[PDB]
Structure 1
Amino acid sequence: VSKANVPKIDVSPLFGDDQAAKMRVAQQIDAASRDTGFFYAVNHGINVQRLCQKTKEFHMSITPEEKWDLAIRAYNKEHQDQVRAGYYLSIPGKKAVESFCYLNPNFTPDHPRIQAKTPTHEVNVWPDETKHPGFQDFAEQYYWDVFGLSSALLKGYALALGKEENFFARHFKPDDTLASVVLIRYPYLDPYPEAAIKTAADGTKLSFEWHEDVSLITVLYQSNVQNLQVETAAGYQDIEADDTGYLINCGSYMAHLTNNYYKAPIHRVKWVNAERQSLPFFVNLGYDSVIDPFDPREPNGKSDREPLSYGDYLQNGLVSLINKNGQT
């Protein structure tokens, strides 16, 4: 298997005021987005070792009782308001992965979209503070840390596309972003049940099949265990692990807005019998956010795509991904 070209890009100028240095970062984002569609953001300022420490403490502390009490409606019919946020249980013998998803901490009971019961907005559920001391506070702060990195990355993508640096970020706001964090646990199992292993057409053993992301961009931390592959013209290629950087790729909303100039790369998760963490942040805009599609390969920049509101995109995309690749 070929090693995929996944450059390491120092994104630290995107936090500062050196506009020429920011354009040199934007060029690197442009190049990576036009090639394999993946890069590692380095010098990103986030303490990922502590993220891993706190997530591990959670995954290793949580009990079967708590998992039912936090479970999304796919696992617990009592929790009809929990579509996105909460616990996604494993099924021993059948489904190995388990995870905990949370949304914008500003989606509180008094938030206008929660009052309205607008789809894709939910109030987060949390375990009991006494059983998981500090976890909720850590997780909410992590949301804002990775929100900050993502805002910076979005300035880079905007400049890369010939736009002003606020072009995406003006739609990515603390009060209404639909962005989510998922704390995924992939277990070591001995024996590992075959029913929890999928097989690709090319014979590769998988934990999660080929897909494009439902996101504007995806901002991912993972353990130092190689598992991801990206489809290129030369076939599926291995993405090297780097548990110091964030792996960045575009989702299909970016592909829509740019008329596939920045494609949403097809990728999949190899089966690995290893205890590891996968911690994506899906960079989603607000429910009513709508960016007019354009084409940076066309002189007048015009596109034959129709505008699509982010809330429409997200609600439909998350259902479709479950139907295609299964309930996580």
Structure 2
Amino acid sequence: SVSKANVPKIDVSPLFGDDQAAKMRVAQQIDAASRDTGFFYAVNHGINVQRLSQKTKEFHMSITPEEKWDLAIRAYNKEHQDQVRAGYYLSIPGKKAVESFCYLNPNFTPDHPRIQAKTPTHEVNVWPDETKHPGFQDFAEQYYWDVFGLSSALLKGYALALGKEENFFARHFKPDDTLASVVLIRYPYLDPYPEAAIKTAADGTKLSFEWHEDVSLITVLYQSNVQNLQVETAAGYQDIEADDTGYLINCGSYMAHLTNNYYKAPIERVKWVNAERQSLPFFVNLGYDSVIDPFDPREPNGKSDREPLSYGDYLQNGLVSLINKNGQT
């Protein structure tokens, strides 16, 4: 028997406005959700998620093996030593079902001083041929900024929820240096589905991806309408209901650190489902040198002894660890 997680739907539209009290009522809901299962669905968010899913689908179903190699990250193509994060993540028929395409801040160009300095976790995006994928780069870049704008508003809600001024997080979330990423993930329908691509949890559940905590400040996730996600609670894993009009939001482990675990990063996993579906996370990362001073909302004086963590160092450590624990995606 598996229970269902309480994932409230929160109308986030006041966070784009100037009704301060209405923004506090949103913040209260974010607070409650963050202290309960850790998840909520952001609704009335203003993003055209039908176009997002449509363009994503066109890309996944039309890219060829030749293009995948040409775009592949270093884990699949030794020629691409600079592509640790951005690029195509190939499936392995018979062994690995999932495939995906990751891109970063469009402002990371050869002109960018972080690229000039070769700072870790910064890369220039790679893209397919425009004539073979008309409109795809423009769509993807536009979506990055559309979801950046939503995430900025959500971060105002999280700041208010923790008793802070509304820019406490968002001031560090900037288009010129954000390390945030979009991943366009395809989960395919396969018949027969390779058992090699299915993992079995301790509790016997068949999984496509084992338990993990997000490496992010927050995670802003769109998925098609196929239930798959679960969140761990003390009483076991609970199913997260699907909603292909909303964004599923949760705090990442950077948030857990800076709030002294008041807003924990939920432990989540992906059930195996033999169904064609899409999973499109936006990982809200800050700048490489962004440092948020920890605090403890449980203490009268709000004082935490936790060390201020530079975000870039945090991101580098978290992404290599996630690969080491749950395998190369």
Deviation at 1:120, TM superposition (A): 0.2
SS of the equivalent of 1:295 reads coil
Distance 2:194 2:326 in 1: 18
Deviation at 1:326, TM superposition (A): 0.3
Deviation at 1:304, TM superposition (A): 1.9
Deviations 1:33-72 (A, max 9, x none): 0000000000000000000000000001100000000000
1:39-78 alignment runs, 5 A limit: 39-78=40-79
Q: What are the ranges of 5 or more consecutive residues in structure 1 without an aligned counterpart?
A: none
Deviation at 1:269, TM superposition (A): 0.2
TM-score (norm 2): 0.99
Distance 1:309 1:113 in 2: 15
Distance 1:48 1:159 in 2: 27
Deviation at 1:233, TM superposition (A): 1.7
1:68-217 alignment runs, 5 A limit: 68-217=69-218
SS of the equivalent of 2:148 reads helix
Deviation at 1:312, TM superposition (A): 0.5
Deviation at 1:267, TM superposition (A): 0.6
Distance 2:105 2:99 in 1: 21
Distance 2:230 2:103 in 1: 26
Distance 2:321 2:303 in 1: 28
CA RMSD of aligned residues (A): 0.4
SS of the equivalent of 2:3 reads coil
Deviation at 1:95, TM superposition (A): 0.5
Distance 2:42 2:175 in 1: 22
Extract structure 1 runs of 4+ deviating beyond 4 A.
none
Distance 1:169 1:63 in 2: 39
Distance 1:46 1:199 in 2: 36
1:247-326 alignment runs, 5 A limit: 247-326=248-327
Distance 1:21 1:251 in 2: 25
Between Structure 1 and Structure 2, how many residues are aligned?
A: 328
Deviation at 1:172, TM superposition (A): 0.1
Deviation at 1:234, TM superposition (A): 1.7
Percent pairwise identity: 99
**Residue of structure 2 equivalent to 1:38:** 39
**Residue of structure 2 equivalent to 1:23:** 24
TM-score (norm 1): 1.00
Deviations 1:115-174 (A, max 9, x none): 000000000000000000000000000000000000000000000000000000000000
SS of the equivalent of 1:28 reads helix
Deviation at 1:178, TM superposition (A): 0.1
Deviations 1:174-230 (A, max 9, x none): 000000000000000000000000000000000000010000000000010000000
Deviations 1:20-43 (A, max 9, x none): 000000000000000000000000
Deviations 1:229-272 (A, max 9, x none): 00012210000000000000000000000000000000100000
Distance 1:107 1:18 in 2: 35
